[PDB]
Design a protein around this nucleic acid. Structure first.
Ligand SMILES: [Mg+2]
Ligand SMILES: [Mg+2]
Ligand SMILES: [Mg+2]
Ligand SMILES: [Mg+2]
Ligand SMILES: [Mg+2]
Ligand SMILES: [Mg+2]
Ligand SMILES: [Mg+2]
Ligand SMILES: [Mg+2]
Ligand SMILES: [Mg+2]
Ligand SMILES: [Mg+2]
Ligand SMILES: [Mg+2]
Ligand SMILES: [Mg+2]
Lengths: 117, 243, 95, 240, 45, 76, 95
RNA sequence: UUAAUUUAUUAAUGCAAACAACCUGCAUUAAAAAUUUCGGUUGGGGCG
RNA sequence: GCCUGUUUACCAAAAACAUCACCUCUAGCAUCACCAGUAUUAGAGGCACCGCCUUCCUUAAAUAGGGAUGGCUCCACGAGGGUUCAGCUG
RNA sequence: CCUCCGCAUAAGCCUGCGUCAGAUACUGACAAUUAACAGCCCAAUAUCUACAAUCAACCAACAAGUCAUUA
RNA sequence: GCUACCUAAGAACAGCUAAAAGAGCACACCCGUCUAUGUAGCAAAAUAGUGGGAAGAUUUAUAGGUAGAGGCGACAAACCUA
RNA sequence: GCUAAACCUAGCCCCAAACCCCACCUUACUACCAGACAACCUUAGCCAAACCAUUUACCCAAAUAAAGUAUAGGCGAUA
């Protein structure tokens, strides 16, 4: 009778409450006997770096100079990353400069994106 | 408030916008133009003026077409502009009697037709009117190629029209392969209906089919900005070297 | 009758009146007598003569007919050989 | 309604099949037949009404051993599990069919009349005239459809040309090609007439329910009436 | 005796008035469309 | 008598669009749209190959192709 | 084909305008059903000898049923079009 | 309901149409229905 | 009224509806009800299980009660409707 | 002194007498119900399965009663 | 999601008497005979006592189905969200 | 003297002009397995006719005028 409250897994009968989740991503599957098989590769592995010796801190000194925001663009990245090599080889097949014809075959495909964050 | 445009002009406005605007001009003109179908279920007036006997004066007369209902089954067949008449009658044909709902349906037959241009036999649900029209046109191919969209009133008929027109436009050797003389004879027989292939591709397409065709034509995976920037940089370097 | 039509907003004419009455322009309405064509074999010659006559209407009948017709039917008509041309106007009338 | 018929099984089997009651309802969910509903839960035993069904990669007349004779909830007749070669099947049991009996199923129309032993199936052409029969086909190989209820027995009235005249239990004559198979004898459970229901509860167990409004037409049931002609209208209801 | 005609059950509620059943027919789609036009916070039940 | 009533048997696929019967032209289907629409032709999808391979979504080959299949029928 | 006619006359729409139809304009009377018309004959030119009709190159009036079911489908005859008539005339004068 | 009006729809036939099935049109007969009405005078009603 | 049951949710629980039993009418048959049935079947209507044959008494006073194809037969049962003995009781 | 009451599950409800602070089981804030119970299943294709239950042993039947596995 | 009927798959029915029962008495449970209370009530049909059924044509939970001239009806024109 | 009483803009009306991250169809807002059902088909009636039974105006694609005219119509209501 409550049409306004959000539909959660706390509300229906036993089957409803078991079936609905809370947004947690799946980790494996269910076999016969409702035994849950957890797939290791499905579990997000946290790639945490070693922070020993790191100099950066959560905050920045107010003594730091102010600067103008210049959002990075594809043109700027190309100029700062590919243009030098292109000029040096033109003065003297784009895969040599970094371009890849297709994202297929890569672990981290840029589109459709196949990696977290 | 009021709309800037009348609501009945909204479809035309939409046609003048978006992908429908990118649609080819000849197809858009074919959609926009509307011709009254040939009278089928009513007898047209002989002339534009008539001496009505009641007062003996010359009065203008108009032919008001009977609304015809075409069930979706008709789009899979060739009904010669014939369809269901959904109307009403006066019982015993006197206006002072009851008014009854009456549906007149055409007598449908299944017949096999051979298309010379397509070298194929089609089994088509058909009417005696369609058979008579085919006889008057001297064959199924002539009937399909002569009859306009409105008189044909069949999605299957318009698809046959598109197929025949494409065959003629391409002069496709797939018509009787290994018999070029026969193929040329057929094409010469139906020469007068030949049109450019760019136009024959769009014959008989519904608006949604045409939109999908245009979207498929103009769908291109975006060129990587790497290629664009490389071309621009090489062009700029060429200009700098020349200067 | 229809005082305001749905398509023009105009007042309509009751065509039953036009099919039956003649309006003389001065404001007189002429009519035939009821039954003037019915069972003449059983009517006396005097009764038939009375029935074959064109007859004027009352003041209230005329007012009703005027209300039931529009101004088009109350105009001057200059027909070629109208038999009622002389009757369209009143002469030597005192009040 | 989301009604799907329970008669979906495609492969013949001996195992009783769980059958769903209808209640007299169409697939539309509306009552089509009144007076049906409830009753004891039943399981359906698929009856092979084509008695001459030679086994796979086999042909010719074959014999079968009556494994057992059983009550069938879905029929007036009792059924017989009968086994031949390497298969078992349910057939309609005849009056004196017993466990361990032997049954013959033949397609051979002998020139002479075959000795008609109760329970075996022969083409109607092979039977003597006047023999009691049951499980009669209408067409050769169609499968038995007539004379199937308990204790029923048609009579092979006549045989001329390739056509036989059968007297159905309703005492109506039927013409069937003599190549159509029928089994000899009357159907079993011959005392089905004499069973007394005794109480309304037993009918309710059998799945018959008391139902009213069985006609659904305006005014309900209305017996046919003779509409008098105009000359006869003057005498329809003459007063005393 | 009367008044308690509502005997709640979420299965029946969702199966009878839910979004899926509303969309399952053109009439229910028009129900949802009317609620959207009116601005109802709750389109379906 | 055949077992299995029609209403329970798998429904026959709808008849092919007449556009597929006309030799020279390519039908316009909703395959490009990646979803069904009722006013476009129904695509003819090639059979999908990578399907019956995953262990939890596996289809066994027909009995004829099994390694121990033998024409002579044993009785176990 | 069923040919129908309005019981109620439709008022004239004009030149560029479309007639406005009301409920009474959907009442029709059947003036004729073409299927009940007497059968006519189809003019065909024969290409192969056919029993009791002709031999070849001769214009024949055949029942529409025969013409559309046997002669034309089997190639025994061709439509009596002007082109076919001319071609068979050239054949006749070349023989 | 033996009130009036219909038979659009089904079901039968018949005649045309398509070459037996199936189907279209036109009729006729039914079933099922549908629409509509309940004048005036005489304490009321019956018969008037 | 055969019986057990059912019914006017919210003024009627009954003699009404149903019911076994019986009768009548209709139907010779397959793949969605009837029915995965086939005349000992199915559908509809009627009827009512069954079985057989064809002025006096009561009170003192009693408009109350009981007794001198149909006709009949009440075994049992009933919060049915009447009557009564005795007892019991504000 | 009283109760066919109580405790649990289901279904339903959704924080609705826990703590604190303001009011007169209200308002606000803070806290809380931890899976073993329960739900959420099954890799398919074929082929298999006549033999009730009722202490299931005698006796007692008819209304004839899902139990789906194996290569 | 009431109610009427139905479908699928469940569940309940002490004790005594009797013996395989639409059996008897009588709990739970279902109902609603009669009386009283109540009558803006605790209640838009309740309470108390009494009473009928209570292994069945029983009662009942869950899910599904039949929709308005329609459904459903052991026919009361009953019931289909007071 | 209590309860009250009063207020003015919050907005609204009619014109003109102008054409206007993630989740979610399964029990919606639910990361993740064999599809295929996929839509189209005269409005009726209230009402007027003082009942009613034929009939009884209704986004039309230039306002005005022709003209409530010609016509239609239980030739009547009306159109
Ligand atoms: Mg309930
Ligand atoms: Mg004009
Ligand atoms: Mg009784
Ligand atoms: Mg009783
Ligand atoms: Mg009551
Ligand atoms: Mg009562
Ligand atoms: Mg007394
Ligand atoms: Mg007990
Ligand atoms: Mg009992
Ligand atoms: Mg009931
Ligand atoms: Mg009654
Ligand atoms: Mg009126």
């Amino acid at each position: 009778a409550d049409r306004m409250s959000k539909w959660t897994s706390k509300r229906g009968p036993r089957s409803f409450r078991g079936r609905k989740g809370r947004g947690a991503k799946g980790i494996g599957f269910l076999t016969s006997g409702w035994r849950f098989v957890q797939i290791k590769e499905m579990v997000p592995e946290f790639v945490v770096p070693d922070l020993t010796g790191f100099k950066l801190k959560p905050y920045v000194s107010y003594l730091a100079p102010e600067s103008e925001e210049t959002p990075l663009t594809a043109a700027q990245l190309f100029s700062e990353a590919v243009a030098p090599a292109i000029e040096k080889d033109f003065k003297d097949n784009l895969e040599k400069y970094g371009f890849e014809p297709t994202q297929e075959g890569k672990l981290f495909q840029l589109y459709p994106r196949n990696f977290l964050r | 408030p009021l709309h800037k445009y009348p609501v009945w002009l909204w479809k035309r406005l939409q046609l003048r916008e978006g992908i429908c605007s990118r649609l080819p001009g000849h197809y858009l003109r074919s959609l926009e133009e509307e011709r009254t179908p040939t009278p089928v279920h009513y007898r047209p007036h002989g002339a534009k003026f008539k001496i009505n006997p009641k007062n003996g004066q010359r009065e203008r007369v108009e032919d008001v077409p009977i609304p015809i209902y075409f069930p979706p089954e008709s789009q899979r067949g060739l009904w010669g502009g014939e369809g269901w008449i959904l109307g009403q009658i006066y019982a015993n044909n006197d206006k002072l009697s009851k008014r009854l709902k009456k549906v007149w349906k055409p007598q449908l037959f299944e017949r096999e037709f051979y298309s010379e241009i397509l070298d194929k036999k089609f089994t088509v649900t058909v009417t005696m009117r369609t058979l008579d029209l085919i006889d008057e046109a001297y064959g199924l191919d002539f009937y399909i190629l002569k009859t306009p969209k409105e008189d044909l009133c069949s999605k299957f008929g318009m698809d046959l029209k598109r197929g025949m027109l494409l065959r003629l436009a391409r002069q496709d050797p797939q018509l009787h392969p290994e018999d070029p003389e026969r193929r040329a004879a057929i094409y010469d027989k139906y020469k007068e209906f030949a049109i450019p292939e760019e136009e024959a591709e769009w014959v008989g397409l519904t608006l949604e089919e045409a939109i999908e065709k245009q979207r498929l034509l103009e769908e291109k995976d975006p060129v990587p900005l790497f290629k664009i920037y490389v071309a621009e940089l090489i062009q700029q370097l060429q200009q700098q070297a020349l200067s | 009758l229809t005082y305001f039509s749905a398509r023009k907003g105009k007042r309509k004419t009751v065509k039953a009146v036009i099919d039956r009455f003649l309006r003389l322009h001065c404001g007189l309405w002429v009519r035939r007598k009821a039954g003037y064509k019915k069972k003449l074999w059983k009517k006396t010659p005097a009764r038939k003569k009375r029935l074959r006559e064109f007859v004027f209407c009352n003041k209230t009948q005329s007012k009703l007919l005027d209300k039931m017709t529009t101004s088009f039917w109350k105009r001057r008509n200059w027909y070629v050989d109208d038999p009622y041309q002389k009757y369209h106007d009143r002469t030597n009338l005192k009040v | 309604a989301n009604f799907v018929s329970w008669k979906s099984r495609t492969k013949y089997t001996i195992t009783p099949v769980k059958m769903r009651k209808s209640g007299g309802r169409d697939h539309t969910g509306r009552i089509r037949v009144h007076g049906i509903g409830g009753g004891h839960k039943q399981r359906y035993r698929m009856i092979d009404f084509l008695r001459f069904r030679p086994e796979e990669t086999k042909s010719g007349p074959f014999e079968e051993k009556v494994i057992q004779v059983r009550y069938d909830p879905c029929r007036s007749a009792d059924i017989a599990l009968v086994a031949g070669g390497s298969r078992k099947r349910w057939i309609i049991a005849t009056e004196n069919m017993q466990a361990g009996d032997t049954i013959l199923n033949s397609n051979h129309i002998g020139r002479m009349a075959v000795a008609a032993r109760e329970g075996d199936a022969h083409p109607l052409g092979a039977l003597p005239v006047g023999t009691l029969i049951n499980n009669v086909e209408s067409e050769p190989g169609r499968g038995a459809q007539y004379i199937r209820a308990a204790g029923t027995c048609g009579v092979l009235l006549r045989k001329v040309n390739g056509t036989a005249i059968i007297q159905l239990p309703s005492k109506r004559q039927m013409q069937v090609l003599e190549t159509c198979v029928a089994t000899v004898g009357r159907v079993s459970n011959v005392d089905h007439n004499k069973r007394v229901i005794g109480k309304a509860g037993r009918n309710r167990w059998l799945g018959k329910r008391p139902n009213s409004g069985r006609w659904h037409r305006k005014g309900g049931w209305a017996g046919r009436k003779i509409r008098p002609l105009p000359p006869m209208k003057s005498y329809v209801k003459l007063p005393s | 005796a009367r008044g308690n005609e509502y005997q709640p059950s979420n299965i029946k509620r969702k199966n009878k008035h839910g979004w899926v059943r509303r969309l399952s027919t053109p009439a229910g789609v028009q129900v949802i469309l009317r609620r959207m036009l009116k601005g109802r916070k709750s389109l379906s039940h | 008598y055949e077992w299995g009533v029609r209403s329970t048997r798998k429904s026959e696929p709808p008849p092919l669009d007449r556009v597929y019967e006309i030799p020279g032209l390519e039908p316009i289907t909703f395959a490009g749209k990646m979803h069904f629409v009722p006013w476009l032709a129904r695509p003819i999808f090639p059979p999908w190959d990578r399907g019956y391979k995953d262990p939890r979504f596996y289809r066994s080959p027909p009995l004829h192709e099994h390694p121990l299949y033998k024409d002579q029928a044993c009785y176990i | 084909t069923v040919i129908v006619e309005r019981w109620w006359k439709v008022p004239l729409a004009g030149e560029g305008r479309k007639p406005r139809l009301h409920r009474r304009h959907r009442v029709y009377k059947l003036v004729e059903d073409t299927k009940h018309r007497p059968k006519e004959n189809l003019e065909l030119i024969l290409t192969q000898s056919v029993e009791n009709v002709g031999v070849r190159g001769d214009l024949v009036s055949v029942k529409k049923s025969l013409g559309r079911n046997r002669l034309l489908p089997q190639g025994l005859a061709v439509y009596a079009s002007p082109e076919n008539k001319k071609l068979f005339e050239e054949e006749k004068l070349l023989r």
